[PDB]
Amino acid sequence: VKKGFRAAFRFQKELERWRLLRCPPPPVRRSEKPNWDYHAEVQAFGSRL
């Protein structure tokens, strides 16, 4: 048992990657995910075009 938590922290990230590949997550609409404001998104839609 080596001293330190940084290697343990890194490995948790890789276990996350492996799990995603084997069991892909079901799709979700972007509204549910963070960083969403409906009013601002609509205005940018027009200006984009």
Binding site: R29, R30, F45, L49
Partner: protein, 49 residues
């Protein structure tokens, strides 16, 4: 697709198609025929290249 409001995600194609033309309709009312004609040329006529 991101801005659509519906009860099912991913949005079914008939629902997605309908919202697309509704947007063109809203553009027609706001800015009139000449603008919309450019819109159809740029995004729909291009697809026959």
């Amino acid at each position: 697709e991101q801005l659509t409001l519906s009860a099912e995600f991913p949005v079914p194609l008939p629902v997605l198609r309908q919202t697309f033309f509704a947007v063109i309709g809203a553009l027609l009312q706001s800015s009139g025929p000449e603008r919309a004609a450019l819109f159809i040329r740029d995004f729909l006529i291009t697809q026959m290249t």
